[PDB]
Ligand binder design. Structure first.
Ligand SMILES: [Cl-]
Lengths: 167, 195, 240, 241, 243, 235, 250, 244, 231
């Protein structure tokens, strides 16, 4: 991302997904899989909209729908069942979050919330942090707030965080 | 080597170190001094892998002596211990690490206080009232936890040290051929020739 | 790297850079070394152009290389620190490997070797420093006094001076120093060293530094008052 | 006076070695011209084969840097080929590292930065060349970017380089003052080449045969040079109107 | 002034005087030529017999690069050898990576870039040789000539050394009188003549003729030296023409 | 300025020729080779009477069978001696034998021309290398900063060299004894020296097969000086 | 080959002058005028787009450059030297700061890094000094708005307002009369345009003038939404139209 | 080759002087005067900014006084860019010492290190020396309050009171006249400002043309405080001492 | 003049003065002669002494069992170049089990000397060499100049007054080339050739140095009483 920004400034052009893809794969390949990064790279640029996957050893794949991680099989099952050509934005978000939910529920390595990011052509990318929150913890039966003075203390002291003082 | 002990009393630090040098199935020497004087008021005992122990000790000694000449000044025990720790902490991630554990007993002439530092080969430093390396602590810390009081006199420290050595001679399997005892105080370093 | 040959021969067979380094020594404050029967004394000039100086912290002219050897110098002050540092490192290295402190001759040979190396190495200029190295060999009561110079030559001296107006004080020492009977005591040796500096120094106040080295690592620097007593006694005998 | 031998500042704040490299630029006595069409960028250059023993096919100052980028050089051929080989290497490396074809303006900047280094570092001399890069960029469209020994570079609507650059420059300036557009409003590249040749004839005041010119044309996704017969066809069309 | 004391320095003209001084060393050397024929190339060189003690046919000047390229040069002979040694390294690495033998235009640039590199710094001297070279590749015959500046072009005929003006005039006649082309065997004969005619500029000492050739039909596209009967046939033809 | 490794129009290296001038300013050193041994003698030349003359070391041991005398910038000789000693010892380690005097000299002379822009300048010192081996017997070599070494029956280097060499020309013959050579070195040193020759400002040494290389005591040399004075007064 | 110039090309003369730095400053003096003015809520930097030919597209040549989202730079002197400095300045902002602290460097520290690079060209072997003076305007959270000048020597000074290059002496006098500590950004832009008109001979419009500001955060120029703490770059280059609008109220 | 253009920065003159060092000192003699005065209860650092402008942002500006650590500070005279290179090196050295020994670096050791770096540039490398002279004001528990100076030669010396930069001859005479050993910080502050006021090439000494700092044990109990004076605080001390 | 400061500088007429000055060092050197027949190749060298007490500087160096040279000029440079030849002869044997061709040996020397004439910092070699050898194509004689120029010859001479010996060989060309299977007569011709370069001094027992290589004759050097036969 740093090198892409510098490259964008050098070329006076908006960065391309294939540039990030190429820079990532060559870096990962060089480290022979020891950098355990498995990525799904997506974005829009002057060339159009793109979607790629990257594995730790440096291999890349193209597709209309992709999934990675321990819950990728649960997700891919949903994608293979419901994906179609010419999806709308609203349909794609739904399909994407449903694929993540499949992982959340059925995969122990996955859980909690669903994060989404939509990159549409000719628009600002919208990052939807905690798009879904289907795992809020229920209220506890009891409050475990202690009575003050419950813990036994030996010593107390003020810590000097300030600098050396004047006068 | 085997057993190295340290105890910091009121006005001095006492280091006890075994005399045996066993190389396999034979006790080669029974009068080995496992210590080096780093500066007039700083003593370092050591134990670990053969060769590495002396090589490390003399390397540290040389560095501190070089500092003393350059600045015409003796480093504090705390400063020397920090220098030693850094060398070992550097060493542990080397091609071939120094396999050496040390105790640094010094008398700080500025603060007028004895100071005992225990540092292992990983570069793990701790300031203690009494310390040990290897299996020595397993026997001796219970006695020290019991009979030690911080206002002890050097003579009381030596008596408590005798109690430690007696327990070691009773329960340890290896014959370490007694110990050489050295005292570090305001007047410098001296050896107790009868122990 | 910068490889330029700065020290080179001239048509008349001179290495001007080495010779110009001697001119830097000629400019430096006077230093003198006198060895007695059981001691060596190193005298050093302090130019009184610099007052408001803090004499506690200002780098002293005589430097301990080890507990038994000392080094004074004339010439570039910054250059002298590099030689002193190298010498101190070599002194500890010698103790570490040989298990015995350096002889005064060995330490001199090392410092002289460093100075020589800088006269035929690329990209470096010679040291603008001559040194006086004095002390006592381990377990030996014979006094030692050596001199070095930018070219790298070194030699032993019964008494010697270097720096500005060293020609004058060498003149004094040559007529006043007797080899058959050197200064038998510390007093006589210090007195002769102070006398020799008084030929050149100006005022005998804070312009003279004296350092006495005795056998078995017994090195002490005299104070202002102690030196001032020598200065007083010398001139009172002179008024006759 | 060693401030005139290496690239250090003179008391006036000038770099004489850079200025003298500019003078080497005109040593070949060749004039080049570059113009932009709607879908293309055309570059023409004088071709002079003074020796009859020369193989005229090998005499060229136009280079195919990449599939998309072409480069004409004003200056001695050794420095020209030095710049050409480097630009080819840089263009290929760029495609490998970043996954898309190096733009004309980016290559120009890169070569300009390399030239800047020679003006600052003493051991490296400037190249005595002016490099004119042409393409039809996939983002910016028809593009002309020119580099010189000072490390300066800029984009152009049209440009000219050589001994008689000023005459050509003014001729082109006057045309664009009339049309009031940043290019030659023409569909086919053939007619844009005809325009380029016609206006060089008018500016220099000399007639050209097929062997007196050298033409390079940049279109979308390829740059190519015209043969003598392709140029002859171009000269015939000019004469017939 | 002082611009001519250091290599890679531009004079106020925009000239590199050191390269121009290297040319003077080339102009001082013996004559060498190159002739492009129908399906190949012919190289020839003048070898000055300084003394009777020189062993005939032993001090070979023309050099082969790979198995299909011939190189000849005028000026400082060691500089030429250094350039050919580089040419051989360049040709080897090309074939190592790409399998096919190095094409002549490709090979020409390898020498060109290397020679040009010796005009970029004051820590090196330019080459004191003009090199005529060429051979047969997949696209046919090619003849080149490479100057101290790194400048090179393709040629129908090429000549350098002390008798270059005489040689050039002779080469120009052949180009005019043979637009359809010249055969390989004809080119060898003509090459011999031209060296003999160009020897008038070095007429003090007598000389030894040395010829080589690459031809698709005559040598299977490999570089070979002209030896024995074919060499003597060319010498006789040359001697007949001067008389 | 100009290159350090530059040739003059006459075909000589400027720096090598200039180092030879520095050697002419050096103190005299004389070597005489005989069938009973090789004698090496030097002028100490103390700059002041306060300089302890026994610390002046211009004659040096390389090995038990090889000695060396120097003249010129004597500080430059230290690294040459160190190399010589290392070469001599190293060869013994590799081959379980003494090294040939010529081979030792050749190893020293290889350093000479290792200067450029390696060390920054040639050595400013000439060496007389004297020794013995089983193959070629007693030998004396003159090692210069040019990298050239000549073998000599007798040789003088330093400030009084051409005067001393002319004297050695007449005096040397193939039947000289060791005692005769000792006196001859003392005689010629006394001739070319500025100050009056005695045991403190001049030093003798020899190399024999039996005893090896030996620097002479001041008491031993003093007797040879007294023996010289009497034999010159004898006619 | 090898760079055999391992020695300094800038050295002290008997008078104590560093010739090459002085001569670099002379090159800066010949350069086109550029200026910088600091307001209470922003900074403005401006210069003339001196087009070398009317056939040249002067939009492709950027004299005012973004270094970070909140820092911009302009120069006077040798353009090519400026261009490479901007490349290095952009990179050093990442390598020596952003990749360590996860945030962009404050103006003064980025200036310090640029200054360091220029100092090294004044002392290192086989190089001449950079023949430019930079004006770096920027904003950061703890220091607020700031404007720095950086000379060929590597020396840098913070300014309320200043000018460099051709007509700097006259321009600085003009700024001294107009500047106060209560200027709003629009007032500074107005003063910048007035000051810059004096040094310009020919055409004076949005196409011949290059002007940028460090002001309010531009969330419209960020490129994405969804992170409240990311509010967009404070650096903004004024358009040709935006300049001409303010030239009518001039 | 390249030899032709080599100035040879590290050579002796026939008189035995280092050309570049001497010329660097000439450069420094035109720099704004900096003064250091050591007292029994602290140290004062005063320095003059060079012909400033009204448009210079003074409160964020720093060209003379720099902080090396919490105990040590320096006053600069010469090329500011050169000084910052050395300052960053010094700051790193102090941190290295602290990491190694877990104690703050003694003032002299830091001063020696920087002075050794300067020395190196005069003996090897073929590069120009740093055109900088420092005044080091610092404290440690061995020697207490200490003043040092270093110059391009790499030579350093200790002082009770000292000046560097312009008009040091005049300044040093004035300090030598009014300085006494039992002097205190408040008195030293006054002496420093009075000296600058007389030696300045400017018409009058004002707050905007000065940088000022004090190192005091005037910190709550046994510890040391550095005080880099703000523009308003320099203005107040100028009124207090009776200069404006 | 202004263009003789280093080897990297051509003069305005295209000359390399440092190389020419190196060539001058050879002319100052003592004379040495080389000549061959079809069976044998011979080196004859006039050794030079410093004075009457000194030894006579050795002029001939062995490179292999079948190859060696004589020197004229800077002797240390001949040691460097002869050492290089020894290594190259040796590399050919160890790697290819092949004796190094004399022509190829000359090519290697040429290229080594050339690098010193085109680079900054270095200097040309200050010595000339006459290489003789017997390989698979018979007897050979080479003349090496430190400009880089190497030349195969029937006979030649280099050093001071070498023109006299070179003219003699030029007359005797037809005679000595035919001296096949007779080493002593080929040496005689070489000793008679070098005699044409003598003035004042004559060939003595410790003055003369001869070497020979041939069909069934390893490269061997003759000095001292071994050459008294030919005086
Ligand atoms: Cl770049």
């Amino acid at each position: 991302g740093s090198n892409i920004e510098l490259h964008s400034l050098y070329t006076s052009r908006e960065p391309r997904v294939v540039s990030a893809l190429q820079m990532l794969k060559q870096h990962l390949f060089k480290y022979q899989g020891h950098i355990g990064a498995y990525l799904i790279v997506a974005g829009v640029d002057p060339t159009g909209s793109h979607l790629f996957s990257i594995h730790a050893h440096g291999s890349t794949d193209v597709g209309y729908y992709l999934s990675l991680g321990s819950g990728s099989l649960a997700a891919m099952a949903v994608l293979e069942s419901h994906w179609k050509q010419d999806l709308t934005k609203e349909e794609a978000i739904k399909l994407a979050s449903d694929a993540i939910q499949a992982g959340i529920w059925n995969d122990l390595g996955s859980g909690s919330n669903v994060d989404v990011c939509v990159m549409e052509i000719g628009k600002d990318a919208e990052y939807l942090r905690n798009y879904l929150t289907p795992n809020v913890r229920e209220e506890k039966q009891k409050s475990y707030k202690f009575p003050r003075g419950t813990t036994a203390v030996l010593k107390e002291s003020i810590v000097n965080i300030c600098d050396i003082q004047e006068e | 080597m085997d057993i190295i002990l340290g105890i910091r009393v009121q006005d001095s630090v006492i280091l006890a170190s075994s005399k045996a040098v066993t190389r396999g199935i034979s006790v080669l020497k029974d009068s080995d001094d496992k210590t080096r004087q780093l500066s007039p008021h700083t003593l370092m005992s050591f134990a670990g892998e053969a060769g590495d122990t002396v090589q490390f000790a003399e390397y540290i000694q040389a560095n501190i002596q070089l500092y003393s000449i350059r600045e015409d000044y003796e480093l504090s025990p705390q400063a020397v211990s920090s220098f030693v720790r850094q060398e070992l902490a550097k060493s542990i991630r080397s091609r071939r690490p120094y396999q050496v554990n040390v105790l640094i007993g010094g008398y700080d002439k500025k603060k007028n206080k004895p100071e005992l530092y225990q540092i292992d080969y990983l570069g793990t430093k701790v300031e203690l009232p009494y310390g040990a390396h290897g299996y020595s602590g397993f026997y001796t810390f219970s006695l020290l936890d019991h009979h030690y009081r911080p206002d002890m006199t050097t003579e009381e420290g030596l008596d408590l040290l005798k109690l430690c050595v007696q327990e070691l001679e009773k329960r340890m399997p290896m014959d370490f051929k007694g110990v050489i005892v050295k005292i570090v105080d305001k007047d410098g370093i001296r050896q107790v020739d009868d122990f | 790297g910068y490889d330029r040959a700065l020290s080179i021969f001239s048509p008349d067979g001179h290495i001007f850079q080495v010779e110009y380094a001697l001119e830097a020594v000629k400019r430096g404050t006077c230093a003198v070394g006198v060895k007695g029967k059981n001691c060596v004394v190193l005298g050093c000039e302090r130019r009184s152009t610099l007052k408001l100086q803090d004499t506690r912290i200002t780098p002293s002219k005589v430097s301990k290389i080890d507990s038994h050897v000392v080094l004074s110098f004339s010439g570039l002050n910054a250059d002298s620190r590099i030689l002193i540092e190298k010498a101190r490192v070599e002194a500890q290295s010698h103790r570490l490997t040989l298990e015995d402190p350096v002889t005064v001759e060995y330490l001199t040979r090392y410092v002289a070797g460093v100075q020589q190396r800088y006269t035929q190495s690329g990209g470096v200029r010679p040291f603008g420093v001559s040194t006086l190295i004095a002390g006592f060999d381990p377990r030996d009561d014979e006094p030692k006094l050596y001199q070095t110079e930018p070219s790298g030559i070194y030699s032993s001296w019964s008494a010697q001076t270097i720096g500005r107006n060293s020609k004058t004080v060498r003149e004094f020492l040559e007529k006043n120093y007797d080899r058959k009977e050197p200064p038998a005591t510390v007093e006589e040796c210090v007195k002769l060293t102070v006398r020799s500096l008084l030929e050149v120094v100006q005022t005998g106040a804070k312009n003279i530094e004296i350092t006495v080295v005795k056998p078995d690592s017994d090195i002490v620097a005299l104070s202002s008052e102690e030196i001032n007593q020598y200065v007083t006694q010398i001139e009172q005998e002179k008024q006759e | 006076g060693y401030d005139r031998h290496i690239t250090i500042f003179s008391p006036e704040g000038r770099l004489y070695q850079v200025e003298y490299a500019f003078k080497a630029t005109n040593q070949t006595n060749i004039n080049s011209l570059a113009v932009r069409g709607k879908d293309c960028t055309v570059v023409i250059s004088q071709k002079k084969v003074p020796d009859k023993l020369l193989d005229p096919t090998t005499v060229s100052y136009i280079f195919c840097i990449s599939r998309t980028i072409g480069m004409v050089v004003n200056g001695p051929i050794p420095d020209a080929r030095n710049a050409a080989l480097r630009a080819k290497a840089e263009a290929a490396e760029f495609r490998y590292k970043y996954g898309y074809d190096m733009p004309c303006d980016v290559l120009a900047k890169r070569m300009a930065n390399l030239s800047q280094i020679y003006t600052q570092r003493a051991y490296m001399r400037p190249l005595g060349v002016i490099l004119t890069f042409v393409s039809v960029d996939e983002e910016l469209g028809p593009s002309i970017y020119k580099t010189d020994p000072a490390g300066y570079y800029v984009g152009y609507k049209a440009t000219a380089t050589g001994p008689k650059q000023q005459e050509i420059t003014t001729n082109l300036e006057n045309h664009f003052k009339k049309s009031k557009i940043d290019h030659i409003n023409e569909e086919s590249w053939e007619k844009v080449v005809e325009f380029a040749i016609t206006h060089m004839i008018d500016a220099l005041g000399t007639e050209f045969s097929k062997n007196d010119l050298e033409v390079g044309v940049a279109t979308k996704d390829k740059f190519f040079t015209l043969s003598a017969e392709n140029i002859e066809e171009r000269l015939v069309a000019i004469a017939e109107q | 002034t002082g611009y001519d004391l250091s290599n890679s320095v531009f004079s106020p003209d925009g000239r590199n005087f050191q390269v121009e001084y290297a040319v003077k060393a080339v102009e001082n050397g013996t004559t060498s030529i190159g002739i492009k024929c129908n399906d190949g190339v012919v190289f020839a060189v003048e070898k000055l017999i300084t003394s009777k003690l020189l062993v005939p046919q032993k001090n070979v000047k023309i050099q082969v690069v790979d198995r299909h390229i011939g190189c000849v040069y005028s000026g400082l002979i060691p500089d030429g050898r250094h350039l050919v040694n580089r040419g051989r390294e360049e040709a080897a690495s090309f074939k190592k990576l790409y399998k096919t033998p190095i094409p002549i235009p490709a090979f020409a640039d390898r020498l060109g870039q290397y020679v040009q590199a010796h005009t970029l710094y004051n820590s090196v001297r330019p080459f004191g040789v003009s090199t005529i070279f060429g051979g047969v590749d997949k696209n046919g015959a090619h003849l080149y000539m490479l100057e101290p500046s790194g400048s090179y072009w393709g040629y129908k005929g090429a000549a350098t050394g002390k008798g270059r003006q005489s040689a050039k005039a002779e080469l120009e006649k052949l180009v005019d009188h043979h637009p359809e082309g010249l055969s390989a065997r004809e080119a060898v004969k003509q090459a011999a003549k031209i060296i003999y005619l160009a020897h008038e500029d070095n007429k003090e000492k007598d000389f030894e003729l040395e010829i080589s050739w690459c031809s698709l039909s005559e040598t299977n596209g490999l570089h070979k030296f002209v030896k024995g009967d074919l060499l003597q046939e060319a010498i006789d033809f040359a001697q007949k023409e001067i008389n | 300025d100009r290159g350090v490794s530059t040739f003059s129009p006459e075909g000589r290296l400027f720096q090598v020729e200039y180092s030879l001038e520095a050697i002419k300013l050096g103190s005299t050193a004389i070597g005489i080779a005989t069938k009973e041994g090789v004698v090496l003698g030097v002028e100490k030349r103390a700059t002041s009477p306060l300089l302890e003359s026994d610390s002046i070391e211009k004659i040096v041991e390389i090995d038990r069978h090889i000695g060396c005398a120097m003249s010129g910038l004597t500080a430059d000789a230290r690294s040459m001696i160190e190399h010589a000693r290392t070469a001599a010892v190293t060869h013994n380690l590799y081959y379980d034998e003494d090294i040939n005097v010529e081979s030792l000299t050749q190893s020293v002379c290889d350093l000479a021309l290792r200067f450029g822009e390696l060390m920054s300048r040639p050595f400013g010192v000439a060496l007389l290398i004297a020794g013995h081996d089983a193959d070629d017997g007693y030998q004396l070599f003159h090692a210069e900063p040019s990298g050239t070494f000549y073998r000599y029956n007798a040789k003088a280097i330093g400030s009084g060299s051409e005067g001393a060499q002319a004297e050695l020309l007449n005096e040397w013959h193939s039947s000289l004894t060791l005692k005769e050579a000792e006196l001859l070195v003392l005689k010629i040193l006394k001739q070319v020296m500025e100050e009056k020759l005695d045991e403190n400002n001049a030093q003798l040494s020899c190399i024999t097969k039996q005893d090896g290389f030996k620097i002479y005591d001041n008491e031993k040399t003093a007797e040879l000086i007294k023996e010289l004075k009497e034999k010159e007064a004898a006619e | 080959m090898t760079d055999r110039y391992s020695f300094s090309l800038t050295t002290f003369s008997p008078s104590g002058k560093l010739g090459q730095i002085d001569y670099a400053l002379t090159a800066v003096k010949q350069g086109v005028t550029s200026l910088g003015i600091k307001a209470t809520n922003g900074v403005v930097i401006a210069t003339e787009k001196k087009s070398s030919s009317p056939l040249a597209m002067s939009e492709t040549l950027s004299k005012v450059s973004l270094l970070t989202p909140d820092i911009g730079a302009v120069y006077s002197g040798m353009g090519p030297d400026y261009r490479v400095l901007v490349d290095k300045s952009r990179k050093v902002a990442h390598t020596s700061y952003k990749r360590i602290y996860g945030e962009y460097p404050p103006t003064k520290l980025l200036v310090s890094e640029v200054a360091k690079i220029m100092q090294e060209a004044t002392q290192s072997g086989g190089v001449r000094p950079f023949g430019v003076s930079l004006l770096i305007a920027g904003h950061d959270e703890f220091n607020g708005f700031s404007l720095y000048q950086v000379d060929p020597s590597g020396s840098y000074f913070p300014w309320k307002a200043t000018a460099i290059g051709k007509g700097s002496v006259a321009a600085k006098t003009f700024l001294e009369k107009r500047w106060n500590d209560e200027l709003e950004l629009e007032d500074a832009i107005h003063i910048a345009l007035l000051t810059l008109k004096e040094s310009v001979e020919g055409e004076f419009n949005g196409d011949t003038i290059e002007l940028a500001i460090i002001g309010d955060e531009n969330p419209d120029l960020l490129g994405y939404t969804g992170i409240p703490t990311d509010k967009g770059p404070r650096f903004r280059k004024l358009t040709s139209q935006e300049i001409n609008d303010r030239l009518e109220a001039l | 080759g390249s030899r032709r253009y080599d100035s040879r920065t590290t050579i002796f003159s026939p008189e035995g002087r280092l050309y570049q060092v001497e010329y660097a000192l000439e450069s420094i003699s035109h720099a704004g005067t900096a003064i250091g005065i050591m007292a029994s209860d602290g140290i004062v650092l005063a320095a003059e900014r060079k012909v400033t402008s009204t448009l210079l942002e003074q409160d964020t500006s720093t060209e003379k006084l720099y902080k090396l650590n919490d105990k040590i500070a320096v006053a600069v005279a010469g090329l500011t860019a050169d000084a910052e290179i050395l300052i960053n090196t010094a700051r790193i050295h102090a941190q290295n010492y602290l990491k190694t020994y877990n104690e703050d670096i003694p003032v002299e050791i830091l001063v020696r290190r920087l002075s050794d770096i300067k020395q190196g540039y005069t003996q090897h490398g073929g590069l120009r020396p740093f055109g900088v002279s420092f005044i080091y004001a610092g404290y440690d528990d061995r020697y207490g309050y200490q003043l040092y100076t270093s110059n391009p030669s790499g030579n350093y010396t200790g002082w009770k009171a000292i000046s560097v930069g312009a008009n040091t001859s005049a300044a040093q005479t004035l300090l030598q006249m009014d300085y006494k050993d039992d002097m205190k910080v408040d008195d030293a502050i006054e002496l420093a400002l009075k000296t600058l006021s007389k030696t300045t090439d400017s018409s009058a000494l004002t707050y905007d043309r000065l940088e000022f700092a004090t190192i005091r044990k005037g910190a709550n109990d046994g510890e040391v405080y550095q005080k880099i004076f703000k523009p308003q605080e320099i203005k107040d001390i100028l009124v207090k001492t009776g200069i404006t | 003049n202004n263009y003789d400061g280093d080897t990297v500088t051509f003069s305005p007429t295209g000359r390399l003065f440092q190389v020419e000055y190196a060539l001058e060092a050879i002319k100052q050197g003592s004379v040495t002669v080389g000549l061959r027949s079809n069976t044998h190749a011979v080196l004859v060298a006039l050794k030079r002494n410093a004075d009457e007490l000194s030894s006579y500087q050795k002029k001939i160096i062995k490179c292999d069992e079948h190859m060696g040279l004589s020197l004229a000029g800077l002797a240390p440079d001949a040691r460097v170049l002869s050492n290089y030849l020894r290594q190259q002869c040796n590399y050919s044997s160890l790697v290819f089990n092949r004796k190094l061709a004399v022509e190829r040996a000359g090519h290697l020397l040429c290229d080594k000397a050339q690098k010193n004439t085109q680079s900054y910092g270095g200097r040309p070699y200050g010595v000339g060499l006459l290489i003789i050898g017997y390989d698979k194509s018979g007897a050979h004689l080479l003349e090496f100049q430190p400009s880089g120029n190497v030349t195969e010859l029937y006979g030649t001479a280099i050093g001071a007054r070498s023109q006299g010996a070179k003219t003699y060989l030029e007359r005797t060309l037809d005679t000595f080339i035919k001296i096949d299977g007779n080493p002593d007569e080929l040496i005689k011709a070489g000793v008679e050739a070098i005699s044409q370069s003598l003035r004042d001094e004559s060939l003595t027992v410790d003055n003369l140095s001869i070497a020979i290589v041939g069909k069934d004759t390893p490269f061997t050097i003759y000095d001292g009483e071994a050459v008294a036969k030919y005086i």
